[PDB]
Design a binder for this molecule. Structure first.
Ligand code: NAG
Lengths: 48, 48
């Protein structure tokens, strides 16, 4: 039991550190916002 | 000019409607108009 407990705690710490350090992991969420912003910007720019 | 009221302004050939407000935050060295990301006027300087 102690071995699995320690491994799980270490894994949680590792994933927290990975999220804190790297910044390109959340592309699947940023690209949607970027696409919507580009669509709205193009629609507005079509006025001219 | 009348401020904080929805008017139909006309500044040196530019038209439109809006709520003119004090905008001391913006600093303009010699430029006349203002503009935004989507190419829209957000600030003007009073000719008088
Ligand atoms: C315009 O005339 C008014 C009249 O007193 C004066 O206060 C103002 O400084 C003048 N501004 C310019 C740019 O000539």
């Amino acid at each position: 039991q102690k071995l699995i407990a320690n491994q799980f705690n270490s894994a949680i710490g590792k994933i927290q550190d990975s999220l804190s350090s790297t910044a390109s992991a959340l592309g699947k969420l940023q690209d949607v916002v970027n696409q919507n912003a580009q669509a709205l910007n193009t629609l507005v720019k079509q006025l001219s | 000019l009348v401020k904080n009221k929805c008017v139909n302004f006309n500044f040196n050939g530019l038209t439109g409607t809006g709520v003119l407000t004090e905008s001391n935050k913006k600093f303009l060295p010699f430029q006349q108009f203002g503009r935004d990301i989507a190419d829209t006027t957000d600030a003007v300087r009073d000719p008088q």
